[PDB]
Write a protein that binds this ligand. Structure first.
Ligand SMILES: CCCCCCCC/C=C\CCCCCCCC(=O)OC[C@H](COP(=O)(O)OCC[N+](C)(C)C)OC(=O)CCCCCCC/C=C\CCCCCCCC
Ligand SMILES: CCCCCCCC/C=C\CCCCCCCC(=O)OC[C@H](COP(=O)(O)OCC[N+](C)(C)C)OC(=O)CCCCCCC/C=C\CCCCCCCC
Ligand SMILES: CCCCCCCC/C=C\CCCCCCCC(=O)OC[C@H](COP(=O)(O)OCC[N+](C)(C)C)OC(=O)CCCCCCC/C=C\CCCCCCCC
Ligand SMILES: CCCCCCCCCCCCCCCCCC(=O)OC[C@H](COP(=O)(O)OC[C@H](N)C(=O)O)OC(=O)CCCCCCCCCCCCCCCCC
Ligand SMILES: CCCCCCCCCCCCCCCCCCOC[C@@H](O)COP(=O)(O)OCC[N+](C)(C)C
Ligand SMILES: CCCCCCCCCCCCCCCCCCOC[C@@H](O)COP(=O)(O)OCC[N+](C)(C)C
Ligand SMILES: CCCCCCCCCCCCCCCCCCOC[C@@H](O)COP(=O)(O)OCC[N+](C)(C)C
Ligand SMILES: CCCCCCCCCCCCCCCCCCOC[C@@H](O)COP(=O)(O)OCC[N+](C)(C)C
Ligand SMILES: CCCCCCCCCCCCCCCCCCOC[C@@H](O)COP(=O)(O)OCC[N+](C)(C)C
Ligand SMILES: *[C@@H]1O[C@H](CO)[C@@H](O[C@@H]2O[C@H](CO)[C@@H](O)[C@H](O)[C@H]2NC(C)=O)[C@H](O)[C@H]1NC(C)=O
Ligand SMILES: *[C@@H]1O[C@H](CO)[C@@H](O)[C@H](O)[C@H]1NC(C)=O
Ligand SMILES: *[C@@H]1O[C@H](CO)[C@@H](O)[C@H](O)[C@H]1NC(C)=O
Ligand SMILES: *[C@@H]1O[C@H](CO)[C@@H](O)[C@H](O)[C@H]1NC(C)=O
Ligand SMILES: *[C@@H]1O[C@H](CO)[C@@H](O)[C@H](O)[C@H]1NC(C)=O
Lengths: 119, 173, 1273
């Protein structure tokens, strides 16, 4: 599917970062089968860390590297699976992936955002 | 397809008789599994007594004198979805007179749904010495003959009158 | 004169400006021959060499005073431009403008633009263009910018009169160029392609003679104004009636009774999404997407045991089929008017509301789909006729020499050409013996026969080519065509499957001697000859529609695919690529648009698909109708003028016939000569008495009554006759009485008329045959022969007793007389059609013989893939392995020529054709499992057959039907052929109604207040206010919808009450004012009656809805609300005229309807006798079958329009197991077996559809005669 994400996002230290990820799927998002998979990797060839997932509801894995600063800021029914990172810290810099699966649409979606944090 | 015809109410002594019990499912394309039970109440008695049961291509008879060795199966054959449940009596006697109850126990099979139904049909049969002719046939034949004779007489009278008139006209000319 | 040629110089411009100044100080039409875009008159002769392609003065005196100049190309085409400088910079004498004019007026310019547009159109067909297409797209944009700049530079931009922007077709070029550049700079891609497709419309302005066709098509539309208004009005009234009758009925479903876990319908209906879970609570037939429909009456559909009928859930067909709102009701009524899949809607409505509502469909079909189509069609006929009349009115205003001469002598017309004709007939009959289960010996003999025929044809080809000179030989077109056929024959000899079938085109060589085949050839030639421009326009429109659909909805079909297909694969019909998009457009033109429209609205939205489909239908149908009319009347009147004699050069066939007349007669006479050398007033009075009795009116009435009784006695012999012992006995004895009475009638007729007179009459012969069959049946039954097979097959011939009613009723007699008069002309056009269809049948047999077999999984009816079981032997391995496996084949296919004829009949009528086309495009080979669209481009065969064997075939048929009925009318003095003498008198009396002069004005009343009322009600303001009030009432009734709240119900009720009090009041005012003159006008009588029905029906409906329980009756009397809106036809004069034409056409329609009903009755009795116990599959089910008289009439009315006749025929074609069971036991009856008789079924259905087609054509022409009579008088 078409996934609309910003290639690079620049966020100030201590400010709030909304991570936009929207997908254009023909079929209505049914919450009982819809799948959302948010991962984080330091580099393109680095390991991905699960920190948020929507299997039936929003499941926050609560990673230690993020403390309790990861929150969901989208709405699946309106094709929005964005998340927000409160009080951005320098180690939040990396690559964030939003994987989308919306049955009965066959293909798998993937949006990649490079979050750069400046002073 | 399937037609529910009523059983005849008159059986003659010493001969064979078939009692019809036809129960058609409301939709033909449905699948079911049916078995039947027959009950008989004789004249002079007020209690209905079971006399046979048919299920899974085998006929079970109760131990009763009036029906032992005289009844066979004339219903649906080769299937569990029975829509004809009629039996057949070989030597009708005077104690076969009475009213019958045909209990049909059909188990419909739907998608995630089983419906157990039941229907009852009542057949009252008369046992007499000689087959009484139906009123319908007698009266219908009588009206056929009277209508034929009336039409013929009317036509003949009309030809007579017209021939007399045209003969008078011919003599006048 | 011709000498008037001079270069446009500055002195001439100064003179023109001086003349303009003189005209201003002082302060007409031009020559159409000299009008822009025309040929220069021959009176001017040739052009001086220095004069061509140069600015020269204005020839027309009208523009001689104004500032213009003319330019001439090398084809003598004048162009009128403006002398004012182009944007005040470029002057006429400037070399830049000179070069621009030189480029503008040339052939290499138009050819270059044509090639560019065609290449661009070819490039628009690609759905996923590669990356090397963008440079080509820039090149196309540059070429268009070039021509736009040239035209702007040469003609000026906007300021002048003959300028770039004044041309309406130049706005399209401007819009294209600005869209291209602007959308390129700004960057929906699909939108940008819907803006790029407009370049396909530039073909109209570059191919010459297309603007004229477009203008004529625009003119044909403008004459359709009033008929469109009447169509909208009738569709809206029928939609309101259907909304009232069927609101919410298509949402009935069979809901299960026993629910566990304390569950309820309302709770369940909120937690159901998938059909897999809907199937657990509602009842679905296997393989059905929608739930089964039910009803609450005894004549509606019945739920299975354990399910109860409830109104809940969505409507069928994704929810698009309903009568819930006025919008969907109007869509359904439009569908009924166009008869697109209308049998499905008819079946659903009967299932959900009851069989008694078939009256609504009868009335709707007969009034809309017949009469309104007749009106549109006849108005198009007038428009083109006036166009053609104006056109014709204004248009009129040594050794080698020896042996070649020997060969030329060998060429001899009486025998050689006759021998070749015989050889052609033998060859086509020989190639008609191919079939699928063919032994190798039969194949070998067919091969040697086809080889020897080709050899002898090539021998003819070479012998002629050496007899006459090669330059002389190729002069005749027939010789050239024979040469092409021969060379392709040799080519295939040296070597596809279609190439084998190009030999059948030699059949057209018989058109030299066959006159009505030459008519079809001339029609086909005119389609690409005198009417080539209109056909080209139609092709352009089809291409544009296909590409527009592909661009708009192509990606939606792929992304939204799982909504319209469970396997998440593209359906059979879609618009993902150009070919399938074009197939959808062609199918819509054939008349099937609703089913693809449902998928389009599911994938891409309702509004877009609705607009696109309506526009495609309107434009395409209009252009196809114009092409049909032009072809029909051109070939009817313009082509045939008897310019030459019948075969002016004595036909070789006629020379052979003369030689045969000499020879056979002479030989027979010589043989006869050789044989001769070798060797009582009483009886006359009785006859008069019988004459007196038979010819009396009472005898006729008695016989008519007994015929009616005997015919009605046949309707009772359904499958339930054994529940009605008494009536069965009465019917038997009554049949005996009827036989007696008709024996007596026959004897009386014999004595009165005599054997000679009795047996010269055909009606008497029919009665004699029927009565003889009845007597034989009675004597067989009496003598104990009641169960013999021949006797049991004779007893089914009692369905022919209603044929005795033909001679008793004058309407059926005159309609039958007209039909028998038409027969002889129909026979020849039937023979031509059989030959044309035999060609296609042989081609289809060659293409598809034995390739429709497949290995299917019987329990679910799905073809196995081709990865597993790709062969017949693998299929047999799996049959002997898995039980539910079968290598079955289609019932209707191309195994032989007869089955090919049946397939072609199904395709031409567009009923059951889709299965055939799917099997054809999936075909691989013999004994090979089909693969999905392996032979995808086999759709071309079906498209070509549809065109040639439907469009042109029906064109020829109706073209001959027109002349036949015209000569029928002429010979009897111009009287109507479908009406009786009394009906003729009433027809005249109705004609004087619509032509009365203005009657005496109603006299005003002497009273003051009454005079005020008189001057009020008689004003036109009163009438127009009445019309707007009726329109507001119509809107109020349109607001009603399914599921509306009680507040809306109360509001609408009070508004309707207020309207009733207003209308009743207006009636009281008119009654007070006009006094007794109110009733002297029929329209006021209708108004008074309808206001009475409105009041009474509203009160009665309130009474029933408050103090009674009868929703059906409530709706039936609330239908009385329609009468108020029927008063709108009073103000509309045109729609009033069409309704008057319908009223005039009613009597003949009554006679033809009586004939059709009698034929339907006979076929109903036959169907009850034959197909009562056939398996309930395909179109035969629990409600639509031949078990009873009502069901049979339901089924026959459906296929009177040919709708769904394949679905009815299919269960009959089962003859052997495992298709049917010959020993099926039916409880309550002694009939055994559920098999059908394929031959009887085929004859039944084909004969019925043909007869219905003929009768419908009769009703058509009746309405056309009435329509043309009304408007042109
Ligand atoms: C040359 C020029 C030729 C003419 C070209 C233009 C022709 C017609 C275009 C009409 C425009 C259509 C407007 C509809 C707009 C729209 O968005 O429609 C929405 C409404 C209401 O939708 P809903 O949610 O109630 O449906 C239920 C939902 N479901 C079914 C999924 C369960 O749809 C409805 O009422 C359905 C409306 C149906 C209208 C019938 C079309 C007119 C008939 C033929 C005219 C002659 C051709
Ligand atoms: C312009 C308007 C168009 C008109 C529309 C007309 C519709 C078309 C009408 C007909 C369609 C149905 C034709 C019949 C269907 C084929 C039947 C079939 O399956 O064919 C097989 C049989 C061969 O017999 P067998 O080997 O089974 O015998 C067994 C002998 N043992 C056992 C000794 C070996 O051949 C047969 O009967 C077939 C021979 C008959 C076919 C003649 C071709 C059609 C004729 C024209 C119809 C015109 C009507 C007006
Ligand atoms: C569901 C819908 C339910 C609601 C419908 C309810 C209303 C319908 C029924 C009432 C029909 C009333 C018939 C009106 C005809 C009145 C009449 O008297 O008829 C005259 C006209 C032509 O006479 P005129 O107007 O030139 O003057 C004649 C002046 N006078 C009569 C003094 C000599 O007769 C003719 O054409 C005859 C015209 C026949 C009209 C048939 C209407 C069928 C609809
Ligand atoms: O033409 C002459 C006649 C026509 O009929 P008609 O009643 O004799 O004469 C009517 C005529 N207007 C007249 O009076 O001038 O018709 C004729 O005269 C024509 C010659 C008829 C010759 C054959 C007559 C057959 C009569 C019946 C034969 C026996 C039928 C037996 C039936 C079964 C047993 C009852
Ligand atoms: C010519 C036009 C087309 C033919 C019209 C023929 C006349 C019209 C023929 O109409 C037949 C229908 O009425 C049969 O369906 P019903 O619902 O009426 O049957 C009811 C049966 N039960 C339920 C009472 C037993
Ligand atoms: C069998 O019935 C025959 C009668 O209906 C014949 O009736 P008619 O046509 O004879 O009625 C009287 C006619 N005539 C005799 C006065 C001419
Ligand atoms: C819907 C049903 C359609 C009904 C339409 C009928 C309209 C009714 C027909 O309207 C025409 C009347 O003016 C007929 O007037 P006459 O009776 O004088 O016609 C001549 C009569 N003779 C002298 C030849 C006997
Ligand atoms: C197919 C079904 C077609 C149904 C057509 C219904 C509308 C037509 C129903 O009849 C309409 C009447 O105006 C004429 O009826 P008649 O032809 O019986 O009367 C003509 C005049 N005489 C004979 C009384 C003198
Ligand atoms: C003018 C035409 C007038 C006649 C129109 C057609 C009437 C047609 C009248 O049909 C009567 C019956 O044959 C219909 O039977 P059904 O199919 O409804 O099944 C009945 C089942 N039970 C109730 C017996 C169990
Ligand atoms: C029909 O198609 C099947 C597809 O599997 C062909 O396969 C044969 O299968 C048998 C047993 O599995 C093998 O012994 C053969 O060697 C296979 N054929 C080939 C060509 O490898 C089968 O041959 C086909 N039959 C015909 C008559 O073409
Ligand atoms: C039936 O059995 C009885 C008992 O003996 C006998 O009298 C009668 O004749 C039998 N009838 C037939 C038809 O066998
Ligand atoms: C019929 O039943 C009666 C019961 O009263 C019995 O007496 C009689 O013997 C029975 N007859 C036959 C033939 O079984
Ligand atoms: C009704 O449903 C409820 C579910 O909350 C259940 O507890 C209760 O027993 C049900 N009542 C009956 C009569 O089944
Ligand atoms: C295929 O069918 C049978 C099963 O009925 C199987 O056992 C056997 O191998 C095969 N028989 C024949 C006759 O091909």
């Amino acid at each position: 599917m078409e996934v609309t994400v910003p290639a690079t996002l620049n966020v100030l230290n201590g400010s709030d970062a909304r991570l936009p990820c929207t997908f254009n799927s023909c079929y209505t998002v049914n919450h009982k089968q819809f799948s959302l998979n948010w991962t984080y990797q330091e580099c393109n060839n680095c390991s991905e860390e699960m920190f948020l997932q929507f299997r039936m509801k929003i499941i926050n894995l609560k990673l230690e590297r993020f403390q309790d600063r990861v929150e969901f800021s989208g709405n699946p029914s309106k094709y929005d699976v964005s998340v927000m990172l409160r009080n951005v810290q320098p180690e939040d810099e990396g690559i964030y992936n939003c994987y989308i699966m919306n049955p009965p649409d066959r293909h798998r979606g993937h949006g990649k955002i490079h979050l750069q944090v400046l002073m | 397809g399937c037609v529910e015809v009523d059983s005849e109410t008159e059986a003659v002594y010493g001969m064979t008789f078939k009692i019809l019990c036809i129960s058609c499912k409301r939709r033909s394309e449905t699948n079911a599994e049916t078995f039947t039970e027959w009950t008989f109440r004789q004249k002079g008695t007020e209690e209905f007594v079971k006399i046979l049961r048919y299920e899974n291509e085998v006929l079970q008879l109760e131990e009763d004198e009036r029906f032992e060795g005289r009844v066979v199966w004339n219903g649906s054959r080769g299937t569990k979805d029975l829509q004809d449940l009629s039996i057949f009596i070989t030597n009708v006697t005077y104690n076969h007179s009475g009213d019958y109850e045909c209990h049909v126990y059909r188990l419909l099979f739907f998608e995630n749904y089983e419906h157990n139904t039941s229907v009852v049909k009542k057949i009252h049969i008369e046992v007499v010495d000689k087959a009484n002719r139906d009123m319908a046939s007698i009266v219908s034949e009588i009206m056929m003959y009277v209508l034929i004779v009336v039409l013929t007489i009317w036509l003949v009278a009309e030809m007579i009158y017209c021939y007399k008139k045209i003969a008078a006209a011919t003599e006048t000319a | 004169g011709p000498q008037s040629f001079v270069h446009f110089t500055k002195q001439s411009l100064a003179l023109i400006e001086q003349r303009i100044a003189e005209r201003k100080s002082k302060e007409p039409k031009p020559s159409s021959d000299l009008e822009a875009g025309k040929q220069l008159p021959f009176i001017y002769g040739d052009i001086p060499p220095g004069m061509v392609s140069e600015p020269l003065e204005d020839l027309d005196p009208y523009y001689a005073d104004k500032k213009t100049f003319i330019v001439l190309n090398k084809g003598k085409t004048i162009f009128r431009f403006n002398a004012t400088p182009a944007l005040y910079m470029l002057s006429p004498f400037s070399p830049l403008r000179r070069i621009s004019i030189k480029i503008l007026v040339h052939s290499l310019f138009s050819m270059l633009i044509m090639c560019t547009i065609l290449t661009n159109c070819i490039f628009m067909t690609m759905n996923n263009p590669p990356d090397w297409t963008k440079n080509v797209e820039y090149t196309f944009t540059g070429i268009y910018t070039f021509e736009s700049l040239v035209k702007i530079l040469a003609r000026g931009f906007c300021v002048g009169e003959f300028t770039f922007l004044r041309d309406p077709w130049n706005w399209l070029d401007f819009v294209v160029i600005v869209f291209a550049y602007l959308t390129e700079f700004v960057n929906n891609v699909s939108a940008l392609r819907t803006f790029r497709v407009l370049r396909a419309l530039k073909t109209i302005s570059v191919i010459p003679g297309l603007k004229t066709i477009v203008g004529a098509l625009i003119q044909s539309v403008k004459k359709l104004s009033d008929v469109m208004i009447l169509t909208v009005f009738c569709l809206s009234v029928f939609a309101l009636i259907g909304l009232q009758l069927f609101m919410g009925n298509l949402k009935h479903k069979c809901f299960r009774n026993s629910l566990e876990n304390n569950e309820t319908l309302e709770s369940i209906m909120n937690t159901l999404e998938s059909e897999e879970d809907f199937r657990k609570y509602f009842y679905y037939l296997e393989g059905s997407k929608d739930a089964l429909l039910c009803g609450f009456s005894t004549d509606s559909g019945q739920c299975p045991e354990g399910y109860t009928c409830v109104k809940i859930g969505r409507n069928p067909d994704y929810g698009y089929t309903s009568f819930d709102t006025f919008s969907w009701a109007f869509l359904a009524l439009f569908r009924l008017m166009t008869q697109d899949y209308w049998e499905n809607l008819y079946q659903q409505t009967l299932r959900a509301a009851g069989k008694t509502y078939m009256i609504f469909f009868v009335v709707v079909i007969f009034l809309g789909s017949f009469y309104l189509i007749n009106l549109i069609l006849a108005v198009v006929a007038m428009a083109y006729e006036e166009q053609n009349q104006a056109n014709i009115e204004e248009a009129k205003q040594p050794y080698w020499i020896k042996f070649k001469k020997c060969i030329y002598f060998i060429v001899m017309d009486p025998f050689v050409d006759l021998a070749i004709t015989i050889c052609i007939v033998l060859n086509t009959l020989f190639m008609a013996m191919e079939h699928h289960p063919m032994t190798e010996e039969f194949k070998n003999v067919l091969a040697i026969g086809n080889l020897v025929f080709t050899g002898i044809f090539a021998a003819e080809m070479v012998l002629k080519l050496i007899a006459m000179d090669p330059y002389e030989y190729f002069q005749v077109g027939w010789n050239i065509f024979d040469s092409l056929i021969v060379t392709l024959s040799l080519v295939e000899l040296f070597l596809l499957s279609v190439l084998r079938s190009f030999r059948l085109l030699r059949v057209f060589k018989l058109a030299k001697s066959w006159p009505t085949l030459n008519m079809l050839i001339k029609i086909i030639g005119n389609s690409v000859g005198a009417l080539g421009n209109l056909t080209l326009v139609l092709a352009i429109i089809v291409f544009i529609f296909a590409v527009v659909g592909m661009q708009l909805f192509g990606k939606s079909y792929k992304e939204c695919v799982c909504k319209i297909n469970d396997d998440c694969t593209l359906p059979r019909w879609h618009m993902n690529d150009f070919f399938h998009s074009f197939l959808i457009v062609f199918r819509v033109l054939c008349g099937e648009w609703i089913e693809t429209m449902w998928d389009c609205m599911e994938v891409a939205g309702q509004a877009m698909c609705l607009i696109v489909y309506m526009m495609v239908m309107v434009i395409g149908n209009l252009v196809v109708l114009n092409l049909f009319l032009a072809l029909l009347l051109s070939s009817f009147s313009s082509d045939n003028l008897t310019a030459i004699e019948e075969d002016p050069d004595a036909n070789n066939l006629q020379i052979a016939v003369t030689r045969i007349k000499k020879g056979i007669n002479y030989v027979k006479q010589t043989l006869r000569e050789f044989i001769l050398k070798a060797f009582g007033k009483i009886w006359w009075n009785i006859r008069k008495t019988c004459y007196k009795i038979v010819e009396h009116s009472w005898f006729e009435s008695f016989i008519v009554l007994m015929i009616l009784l005997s015919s009605g006695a046949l309707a009772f012999e359904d499958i339930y006759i054994e529940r009605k012992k008494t009536i069965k006995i009465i019917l038997e004895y009554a049949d005996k009485i009827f036989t007696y009475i008709f024996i007596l009638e026959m004897l009386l007729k014999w004595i009165a008329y005599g054997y000679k007179t009795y047996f010269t009459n055909a009606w008497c012969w029919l009665d004699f045959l029927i009565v003889d069959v009845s007597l034989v049946t009675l004597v067989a039954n009496t003598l104990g022969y009641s169960d013999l097979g021949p006797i049991k097959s004779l007893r089914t011939l009692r369905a022919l007793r209603p044929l005795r009613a033909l001679s008793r009723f004058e309407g059926m007699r005159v309609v039958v007389n007209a039909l028998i008069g038409a027969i002889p002309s129909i026979m020849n056009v039937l023979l031509v059609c059989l030959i044309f269809w035999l060609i296609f049948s042989i081609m289809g047999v060659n293409l598809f013989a034995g390739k429709f077999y497949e290995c299917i999984n019987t329990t679910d009816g799905s073809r196995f893939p081709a990865s597993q079981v790709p062969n017949r032997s693998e299929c047999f391995a799996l049959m002997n392995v898995s039980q539910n496996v079968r290598w079955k084949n289609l019932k209707v296919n191309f195994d032989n020529v007869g089955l090919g004829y049946l397939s072609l009949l199904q395709v031409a009528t567009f009923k059951g054709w889709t299965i055939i086309m799917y099997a054809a495009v999936d075909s691989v080979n013999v004994d090979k499992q089909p693969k999905y669209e392996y032979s995808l481009y086999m759709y071309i065969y079906f498209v070509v057959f549809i065109i040639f064997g439907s469009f042109f075939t029906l064109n020829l048929f109706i073209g001959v039907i027109i002349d036949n009925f015209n000569q029928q009318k002429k010979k009897l003095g111009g009287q109507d052929i479908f009406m009786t003498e009394e009906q003729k008198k009433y027809y005249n009396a109705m004609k004087k109604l619509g032509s009365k002069k203005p009657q005496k004005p109603i006299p005003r009343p002497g009273n003051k207040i009454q005079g005020c009322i008189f001057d009020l009600v008689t004003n036109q303001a009163f009438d127009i206010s009445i019309m707007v009030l009726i329109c507001l009432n119509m809107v109020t009734m349109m607001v009603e919808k399914e599921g509306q709240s009680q507040h809306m119900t109360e509001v609408l009720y009070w508004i309707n009450v207020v309207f009733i009090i207003l209308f009743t009041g207006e009636c009281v005012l008119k009654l007070i004012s006009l006094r007794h003159y109110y009733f002297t006008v029929g329209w006021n009588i209708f108004d008074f009656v309808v206001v009475i029905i409105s009041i009474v029906g509203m009160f009665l409906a309130d009474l029933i809805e408050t103090y009674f329980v009868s929703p059906t009756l409530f709706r039936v009397i609330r239908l009385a609300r329609i009468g108020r809106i029927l008063r709108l036809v009073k103000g509309a004069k045109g729609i009033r005229t069409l309704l008057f034409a319908l009223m005039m056409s009613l009597p003949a329609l009554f006679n033809i309807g009586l004939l059709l009903f009698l034929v339907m009755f006979i076929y109903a009795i036959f169907g009850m006798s034959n197909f009562a116990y056939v398996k309930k599959e395909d179109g035969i089910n629990d409600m639509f079958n031949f078990e009873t008289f009502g069901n049979s009439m339901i089924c026959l009315f459906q296929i009177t329009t040919s709708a769904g006749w394949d679905g009815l025929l299919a269960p009959i074609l089962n003859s052997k197991p495992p298709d049917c069971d010959p020993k099926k036991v039916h409880p309550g009856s002694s009939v055994e077996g559920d098999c059908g008789n394929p031959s009887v079924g085929i004859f039944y259905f084909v004969s019925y559809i043909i007869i219905s087609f003929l009768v419908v054509v009769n009703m058509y022409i009746a309405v056309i005669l009435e329509n043309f009579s009304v408007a042109t008088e």
